[PDB]
């Protein structure tokens, strides 16, 4: 309708990741690693990746053990394509493992023209009275993964947003090396 | 004879208990040098390879019982003359990520130990190496790879005639493994941050020495072009103000000899250095025995009108910087009969009565040492 829903909680900006400059062309797409702040393109793409260093990020980049729910934004920009051109397509998947016999926990589809605004949230959660340790070989735990996929590095240009439900709780320090300045 | 094998109690999920004795699962060895400095590793490993070539009373019920609900407690033997002295802490981490920092605002965070040799003569520790359940085992502390280090914090007031080597004797506890788990409230009673406020050297002399830190300790420990950041600091940075009753750690780290009087009190940003009416402000004299080494310093509510932010933009300055800061004076003189300098280390041990304000959108610099 001509009438959106207010948001209101703050979300924080955590990754961004450009598509490769012109000429590329060629289908691509780029994975995030939701919980320890990663962004991996596909293959050998040049795509542009940035990671910003907010509470958020510097929380789940350190907490060992987590849980609870976090609700996550995801903007997809935005060049200065002729709508009537537009041809461009958003696929997004969250996954718990890049190995190919793991399936999709979840999958969004955007054709949105100039640019898009996806909303969803997710759960994580372990064994160990609740919480989860981001790929550590105990119990086989894995992190969160955001695979996103673009039809036209072209007309697409993505930016991930994140914000911890107050149910969220963590334990246990990481020893992370130093965080370079954006 | 003949005999009911399966009724035998061989089904024992009891977890390791007794006599310290027979509670004993691992001692390993940390080589000083006598020519160490400050952030000098010790000492870096995993906590479970503690146990490698290990032959004590609990070596294996450590590694076989798949489930333990005490503790594991940590002593640490050392001892050097009081002509000198230094501070080693020792640390235990869920993890890590790759050439991960080893400064001791890093490295401490969760749980540690930080003492003095030239004051101890031994120093021990409890922790609870699953942070967030009631109970662990030899097999979760392997694969959820937990670390341990020890680490220089101060290097040697006056070096030892040669090297020491510290002894370090792990066994287990009958304390009962509560958790410690943060959490979103925006009232708590008690949250631990063990921050590394720092470091603060103060040169012998008949100066005015004067050193501050901000209680803005959101943001992280400003390193080069890049920051040092560890899961409690990250953890207090989600809330944009606050306030509450601090509790500070504060450590001798250099040897009996080197002595000086040091006043604390917080105030801000607009008192400049070679000001003798520091005094005026509520403060606390904290001098040590040469026994002595640690002091806890109380700050209650009434000590701040409202609360403050988390973090401020770096560029900043004193004058400009409207958040509390606490100081430490050298009240009368540094000195001793020996050269060095006088080391005090401070931590921030936790809040009390904690209040969270509003949600902090974050910035990305982080404060400087």
């Known amino acids: 309708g001509p009438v959106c829903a207010e948001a209101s909680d703050v979300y924080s900006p955590c990754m961004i990741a450009s598509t490769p400059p012109a000429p590329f062309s060629d289908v691509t797409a780029v994975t995030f690693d939701l919980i320890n702040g990663k962004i991996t393109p596909v293959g050998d793409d040049n795509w542009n990746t940035h990671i910003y260093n907010p509470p958020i990020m510097n929380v789940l980049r350190t907490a060992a053990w987590k849980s609870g729910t976090i609700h996550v934004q995801l903007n997809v920009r935005g060049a200065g394509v002729k709508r009537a051109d537009w041809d461009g397509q958003v696929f997004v998947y969250l996954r718990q493992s890049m190995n190919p016999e793991s399936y999709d926990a979840r999958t969004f589809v955007i054709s949105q023209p100039g640019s898009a ?52 709780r963590v334990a246990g320090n990481i020893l992370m090396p130093p965080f370079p300045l954006s | 004879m003949e005999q009911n094998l399966f009724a035998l109690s061989l089904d024992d999920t009891s977890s390791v208990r007794g006599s310290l004795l027979d509670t004993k699962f691992a001692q390993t060895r940390v080589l000083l040098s006598k020519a160490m400095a400050g952030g000098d590793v010790l000492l870096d490993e995993y906590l479970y390879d503690v146990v490698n070539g290990q032959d004590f009373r609990a070596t294996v019920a450590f590694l076989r019982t798949h489930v333990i609900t005490g503790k594991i407690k940590v002593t640490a033997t050392t001892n050097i003359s009081d002509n000198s002295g230094c501070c080693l802490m020792l640390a235990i981490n869920s993890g890590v990520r790759g050439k991960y920092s080893t400064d001791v605002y890093t490295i401490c965070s969760q749980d540690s130990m930080t003492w003095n040799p030239g004051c101890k003569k031994n120093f021990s520790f409890t922790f609870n190496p699953n942070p967030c359940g009631d109970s662990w085992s030899a097999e979760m502390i392997s694969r959820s790879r937990v670390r341990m280090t020890v680490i220089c914090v101060s290097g040697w007031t006056l070096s030892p005639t040669t090297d020491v080597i510290a002894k370090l004797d792990w066994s287990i506890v009958n304390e009962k493994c509560e958790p410690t788990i943060y959490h979103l409230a925006d009232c708590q009673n008690w949250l631990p941050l063990n921050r590394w406020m720092g470091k603060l050297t103060f040169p012998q002399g008949v100066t005015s020495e004067v050193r501050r830190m901000p209680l803005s300790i959101g943001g992280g420990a400003g390193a080069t072009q890049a920051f040092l950041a560890n899961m409690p600091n990250s953890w207090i940075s989600m809330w944009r103000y606050f306030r509450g ?80 800061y606490l100081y430490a004076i050298i009240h009368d003189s540094t000195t001793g009969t020996i050269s060095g300098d006088f080391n005090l280390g401070v931590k921030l041990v936790g809040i009390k009565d904690f209040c969270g304000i509003g949600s902090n959108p974050g910035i990305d610099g982080s404060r400087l040492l």
């Open chain 1, 117 to 168: 605004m996806l909303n969803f949230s997710f759960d994580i959660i372990g064994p160990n009275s609740g919480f989860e340790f981001a790929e550590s070989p105990w119990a086989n735990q894995t992190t969160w993964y955001l695979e996103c996929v673009a039809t036209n590095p072209r007309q697409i240009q993505f930016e991930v947003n994140m914000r911890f439900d107050p149910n969220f």
């Open chain 2, 245 to 324: 009753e601090l509790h500070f750690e504060v450590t001798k780290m250099s040897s009996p000899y080197i002595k000086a009087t040091v006043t604390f009190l917080i105030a801000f940003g607009n008192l400049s250095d070679a000001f003798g009416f520091y005094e005026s402000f509520p403060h606390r004299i904290v001098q040590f025995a040469e026994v002595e080494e640690k002091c806890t310093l109380v700050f209650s509510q009434q000590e701040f009108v409202t609360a403050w932010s988390t973090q401020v933009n770096p560029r900043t300055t004193l004058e400009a910087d409207g958040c509390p």
